[PDB]
Amino acid sequence: GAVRVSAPARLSFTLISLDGSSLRRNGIAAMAVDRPGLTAEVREAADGIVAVTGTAEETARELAAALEALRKLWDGPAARVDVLEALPQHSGFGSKTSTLLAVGHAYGRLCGVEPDLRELARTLGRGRVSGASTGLSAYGGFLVDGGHVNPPDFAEAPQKYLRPSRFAQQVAPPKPVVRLDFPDWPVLVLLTHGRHLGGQEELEWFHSVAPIPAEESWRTSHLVFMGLAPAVLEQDFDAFCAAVNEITFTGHFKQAQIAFQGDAVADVLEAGRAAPSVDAIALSVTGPACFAFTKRPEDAERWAWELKNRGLIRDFWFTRANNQGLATTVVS
Amino acid sequence: GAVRVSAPARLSFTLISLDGSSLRRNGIAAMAVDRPGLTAEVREAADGIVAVTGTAEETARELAAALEALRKLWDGPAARVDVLEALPQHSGFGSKTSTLLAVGHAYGRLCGVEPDLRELARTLGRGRVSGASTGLSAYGGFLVDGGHVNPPDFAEAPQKYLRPSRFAQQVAPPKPVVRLDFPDWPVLVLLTHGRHLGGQEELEWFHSVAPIPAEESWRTSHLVFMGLAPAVLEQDFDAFCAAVNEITFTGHFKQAQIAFQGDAVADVLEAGRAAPSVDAIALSVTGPACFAFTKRPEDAERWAWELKNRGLIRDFWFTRANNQGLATTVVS
Ligand SMILES: O=P(O)(O)OC[C@H]1O[C@H](OP(=O)(O)OP(=O)(O)O)[C@H](O)[C@@H]1O
Ligand SMILES: O=P(O)(O)OC[C@H]1O[C@H](OP(=O)(O)OP(=O)(O)O)[C@H](O)[C@@H]1O
Ligand SMILES: Nc1c(C(=O)O)n[nH]c1C(=O)O
Ligand SMILES: Nc1c(C(=O)O)n[nH]c1C(=O)O
Ligand SMILES: [K+]
Ligand SMILES: [K+]
Ligand SMILES: [Mg+2]
Ligand SMILES: [Mg+2]
């Protein structure tokens, strides 16, 4: 028998608190979508050898390492995971956290354990900046996590803590301060020509932007918690789009992420802004995934199809929010 | 038979968004506490005459009016309500909303209806600034509501919308963006010598302070959503107290509320700040209720007892958060 696990992608609106004077750092607003999706089957490896197929090399190595670590922790069998549908790696879909937690959960189910997904994220070294994929794996929908309390030594050297996930200090994953069902609105996903960053390239860029001005952290909290989140809660489409657009085009950190990718992303965001068929548009992390909202999906479809034919984007599709998170079925 | 209803008081940390340029106005962080509490019994009035006892005159009139309005709406009997334990009126405990919703709910139960408490709040003209007592009646705990979307005509004359509850434009109550269980920490309630405001006095004061600077709205969102709320979620007492103190002593609107009451409140807040037994202290609305947090309740008890004996406060008691909201039992 196998444990078949399905999980949504994570789209990120923004990181929030990245200045040198705040009580807390990070905080992320995010939502779960069905496409791109993860589908994986976990079964007992007859030869006791951990085996992974269907993913990029980096993810395959960390999945193997995770299944070895969990084999020991839960005194369980060697597992083979066949990733039948992989989340695109390093594309703004939170692929690694979402895949590790889904496969870890499915392996848990094989072993007769039901792991706390946040505790499993901690076990696998996730959540040192973002609790987004961790929270959305458990709950789906729209969430804003509370980031991380800044220790007493933060103020004297903030760049010790204000880092990308790969270089961030060891801490537990944040918990969700806000978790809501996303309204039954369609989401337009655009794959831009944006590049994948190098680890050292990203760390140097991050230290060139953070710490951001205190007032910009505050304004970002304001746009997320007193703009995005209430509009989701009240299913107010026009209010939601105004908040998304204010973050995309004026968010200090988000503008830095856009500028780092350059025209490959900025031209698509500008085209979305000019297009009457697109009510709001956003870059997830540094992309290449962008996402858009529309009360005229029929028109936005034709606009995206033309952009793809012209080669200004790689791909586009409509999806809907996932309001559950991961699901599992036992199959042959 | 009677419907016996018990409900907690509402303590307010701060109003959030009160500037002339924001997407939304208001937003309130609040928590429910057991003491002061409401206890009321609702029964059928044999003579078909709506009767209220146990409250101040203003509350008794609005309760009678509410029970008349609901008698018609639900085609039910005339009700007598005996308020056996009243929430102190105009003292920072959200007495009117909390009492109207509890008695309305209990009357509902008498009529064989289970009303949506937020819709009942709308019916009774509550929630034009604060969704705090409305949300806490339903859920208890700690909550931050999302305030109200600012209409297109807001920017040209913000004082049309930025008003106290009594003078605010007709709108539905806000919904909770954040709702959490409060940790099992004790709360010290202090009744100061603060005065009750007049309606015209409050409206003129409010227009003298609002609209507040945009940056102060943003910083208040930051302290509430990226300070108070994550510390509640993570049950981090020191982080919680740092956020409470930053709001009390630096919050732009809160400082204006303190200054309007003067030494009667400011001296108690300053005494709490200086006192090693008090880790954090706060004014609920304009008071006279203040509330405090301590990891040394034994020491804070002796400190409050001395303040009361000296006459710097009227009263003090320890209570705990209510994590349920209103409850009802059918009695003889
Ligand atoms: O734990 P999470 O909420 O997923 O957030 C952390 C990860 O997400 C971002 O990359 P991206 O969205 O591109 O995901 P990936 O790098 O795992 O594919 C970031 O670069 C981290 O790699
Ligand atoms: O709907 P709510 O969340 O209760 O908030 C609205 C009411 O609360 C404040 O007064 P206060 O806390 O003193 O309550 P009261 O004036 O009803 O007693 C404010 O002056 C409003 O009167
Ligand atoms: N989640 C992230 C984001 C984001 O969501 O924008 N940027 N950096 C990170 C990170 O984890 O390093
Ligand atoms: N709830 C309020 C507060 C508060 O909680 O501080 N100040 N004014 C109001 C109001 O309703 O007018
Ligand atoms: K547009
Ligand atoms: K103190
Ligand atoms: Mg990444
Ligand atoms: Mg009042």
Residue numbers in the entry:
A (entry chain AAA), B (entry chain AAA): 10 to 341
Give the original sentences from the paper that presented this experimental model.
In the specific case of formycin, the enzyme ForT catalyses C-C bond formation between 4-amino-1H-pyrazole-3,5-dicarboxylate (APDA) and PRPP, in a reaction that is driven by the elimination of CO2 and inorganic pyrophosphate (PPi). ITC measurements show that APDA binds to ForT only in the presence of PRPP, suggesting that the reaction likely follows an ordered bi-bi kinetic mechanism in which PRPP binds first and creates the binding site for APDA. Glu211 is essential for catalysis, and we suggest it acts as a general base to make APDA sufficiently nucleophilic.
In carrying out our preliminary analysis of functionally important active site residues, we discovered that the T138V variant expressed, purified and crystallized more readily than the WT enzyme. Bound PRPP and APDA were easily placed in clear difference electron density in the active site. The interactions of PRPP with the T138V variant, which are dominated by the 5′-phosphate and the pyrophosphate, are essentially unchanged from those in the WT ForT/PRPP binary complex, and the phosphate moieties are found in almost identical positions in the two structures. Compared to the binary complex, the ribose ring in the T138V ternary complex rotates to create the APDA-binding pocket, a movement that is accomplished merely by changes in the torsion angles connecting the ribose ring to the fixed phosphates at each end of PRPP; akin to a seat of a child's swing linked at both ends to a rigid frame. Of course, that the T138V variant is active, albeit with a 40-fold reduction in kcat, poses the question as to why we are able to trap the T138V/APDA/MgPRPP ternary complex.
